[PDB]
Symmetry: none
Subunit: 272 residues, 2 copies
Amino acid sequence: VERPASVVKELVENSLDAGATRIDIDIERGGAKLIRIRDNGCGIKKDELALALAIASLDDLEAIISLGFRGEALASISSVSRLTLTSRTAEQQEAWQAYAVTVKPAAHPVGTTLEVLDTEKTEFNHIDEIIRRIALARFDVTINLSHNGKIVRQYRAVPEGGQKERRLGAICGTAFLEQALAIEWQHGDLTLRGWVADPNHTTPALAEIQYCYVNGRMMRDRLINHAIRQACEDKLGADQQPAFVLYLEIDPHQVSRLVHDFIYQGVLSVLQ
Amino acid sequence: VERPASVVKELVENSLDAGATRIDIDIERGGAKLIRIRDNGCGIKKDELALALAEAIISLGFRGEALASISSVSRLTLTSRTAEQQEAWQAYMNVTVKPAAHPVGTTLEVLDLLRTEKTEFNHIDEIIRRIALARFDVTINLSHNGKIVRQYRAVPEGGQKERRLGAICGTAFLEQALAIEWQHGDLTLRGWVADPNHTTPALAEIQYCYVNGRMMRDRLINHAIRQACEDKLGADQQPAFVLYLEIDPHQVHQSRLVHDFIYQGVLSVLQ
């Protein structure tokens, strides 16, 4: 939890794993001043809220801190800024809020919110990137990133088999969206979905977009990249960075040659 | 004339008079279901919040009076925080004022308990459009069911008036827009008028005229603008425009000249 962006990632991640479907994250002054994350995911029972900010004390708590993987992370954060946790769970309950050590009731929908008041705008650009990644990683969750009351981006969630182009356009701009060649490949466990910009029309600006996710986790393999490259260099002798946003899926296999051919094949096909 | 749109207008108005600079208004199901207005203008001290839903403190709430009329028609959920570290609060036949999370501003949830479905939203859209043009200095974001509909960004000192105008009236008009700046003493006529020659009946839908901030609708003002265009070319037909008239306090030669001032202003821009 070094940079603010990193913190955004954390809190935002927590929210997602918490079952979030809408994450409205607002930032003020590179996040240094304010950093608020409000999710509609699971909540935190009043009790957990307390220690969530704060080992002899867990003796009594009787392993309730086990219901807080993020809680552990919160402690690391709160000990670096004015943390103001405030959530309310789903089951028969009222909303609560913690400060600092002071857990009192409050108003809040079945969700969670967090205020944070700890190379100025650079920081925001880092957060923007981060959220971009996540956004593409989870097309099923609305995300709204704002700065100093100024709405910056609104990545609406996409329902079942819906308009993927819209959100893709909002995350990567129409520039890419226009050159986007949608691809759907599948060979048993191997699945390759996503887009690849028409090489012939790929500007170095577009080549900035190179996102590849392997089973949800954004990876970065030189092998996967070479495959996509070679595919384009083969369509046309044009050897240069390609623009893409692909999603690879395979059966648990931490890294295989075939995989390369599967991708090379998938992509190459879409081009022709 | 009490429709949801009307309520939007009220709450939105309140926000503006409260010195707002950004008003993100969201609506759900013609507003019947949800109607949320969040402004970044002066807030409301915890105490005022209470009676605002129900001593000489209610004088600090012209809108507060309005709120009472509303809350007594739906599940009102006021929640604001004044320009101070003092955290946010919220009120709910008695008020339940407790703490809450919210930035220096105000928010209001409204759930009613008839008319049409989508028609209602279109009424709100119109309304916000009016206001938008009336206050080029304040960002407004109207959404529906989580779906962002329009974003009218505010314009800085001597900024780009065309941008926002384009977003409120579309490029169709923006393209035919003939900017006009007239002044004869107290009389001032600013705004735009679409090239008649290229005014489609679709464009003629845009006929907004404000007299000193207040959107008026005088047949006299309209006749003036019309005649001006019918004179440029024999083309007699509804004109497209968005004008702003300014004059010294004079509720309506006292008004004849005004006609000529406008006729003159417009006619000139055409030639």
